[PDB]
Design a protein around this nucleic acid. Structure first.
Ligand SMILES: [Mn+2]
Ligand SMILES: [Mn+2]
Ligand code: NA
Ligand code: NA
Length: 327
DNA sequence: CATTAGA
DNA sequence: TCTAATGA
């Protein structure tokens, strides 16, 4: 956690680089389990060899270890850090809609800068066009103060659309957080559940309304169960216009709402920990259900969940407010 | 680990 | 169809 710090961090630097700049899924994968392992180790790695005794740690990495311990640095890390091509890929990759693959191509063609990006809006798809358009707003955190005004608006129209609609802003916001990255609304309807052959309009009606009133301003992707766009709160009686924010609204089979809701509310740890508990308690929890475990090794049979509670109860735990779902 | 775009 | 990119 701090004892193998630099070690794992160097390791991750390297991993990550193999994956984006180079198209070496393997090495990238190598660097990572080793990083993963030296990370667990209970004592201060004092050399290549010591580390070497580890699984995943071979000669190659052990080697990097010494040089890193030896001189507090790594040549390869210095070179890469310098390396313009890779620098570029690392950066282009920041535009929503651009991945490593595309990052490579752009550079290939010689598109290294945001402006390069601009002079060539054409080579870019919609997603990317939008991502470039709000590069600034996308990079900014969402102040909770605003999260409250967004949540406010969203829930209104929702209800005004159909009243039988259930929405929940999930995520960190849900759990207290002063700021959030993007806004995540979990949606459901009674009319939609596990079987009942859908009702796409369900998601559809909603976006339409939000756009209608001018909250959704763009669409990155809109499908039958997961909408992905851009919103913005109404630049007041002017002077202060608001930033463009990322919004994600997803339809849920009413019969899996809370599991989902449970899930997206995180945190990654609480989740795990919670998930880990249901296991002993004779269960299983996944993004949508909670199944009673059977002795044959496994078993199924989706228990009825009506609120975050039921879930709790099932595993016979203390209902935890979102606020304290921290771990 | 699953949903959408896109070519 | 597959392949990329998001998320989470
Ligand atoms: Mn989010
Ligand atoms: Mn999101
Ligand atoms: Na990106
Ligand atoms: Na393949």
């Amino acid at each position: 956690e701090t004892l193998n710090g630099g070690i794992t961090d160097m390791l991750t630097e390297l991993a990550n680089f193999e994956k984006n700049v180079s198209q070496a899924i393997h090495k990238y994968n190598a660097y990572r389990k080793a990083a993963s392992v030296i990370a667990k180790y209970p004592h201060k790695i004092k050399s290549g060899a010591e580390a070497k005794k580890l699984p995943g740690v071979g000669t190659k990495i052990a080697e990097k270890i010494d040089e890193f311990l030896a001189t507090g640095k790594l040549r390869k890390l210095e070179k890469i850090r310098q390396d313009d091509t890779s620098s570029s890929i690392n950066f282009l990759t920041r535009v929503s809609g651009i991945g490593p693959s595309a990052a490579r191509k752009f550079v290939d063609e010689g598109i290294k800068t945001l402006e390069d990006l601009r002079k060539n809006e054409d080579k870019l798809n919609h997603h990317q066009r939008i991502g470039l358009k709000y590069f600034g707003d996308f990079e900014k955190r969402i102040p909770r103060e605003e999260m409250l005004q967004m949540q406010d608006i969203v829930l209104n129209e929702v209800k005004k659309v159909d009243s039988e609609y259930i929405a929940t802003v999930c995520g960190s916001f849900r759990r207290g957080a002063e700021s959030s990255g993007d806004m995540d609304v979990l949606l459901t309807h009674p009319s939609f559940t596990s079987e009942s052959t859908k009702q796409p309009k369900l998601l559809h009606q909603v976006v339409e309304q939000l756009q209608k009133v001018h909250f959704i301003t763009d669409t990155l992707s809109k499908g039958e169960t997961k909408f992905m766009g851009v919103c913005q709160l109404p630049s007041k009686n002017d002077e202060k216009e608001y930033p463009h924010r990322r919004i994600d609204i997803r339809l849920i089979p009413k019969d899996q709402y809370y599991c989902g809701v449970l899930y997206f509310t995180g945190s990654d740890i609480f989740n795990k920990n919670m998930r880990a508990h249901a296991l002993e308690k004779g269960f299983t929890i996944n993004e949508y259900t909670i199944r009673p475990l059977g002795v044959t090794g496994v078993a199924g049979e989706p228990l009825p969940v009506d609120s975050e509670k039921d879930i709790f109860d099932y595993i016979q735990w203390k209902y935890r407010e979102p606020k304290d779902r921290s771990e």
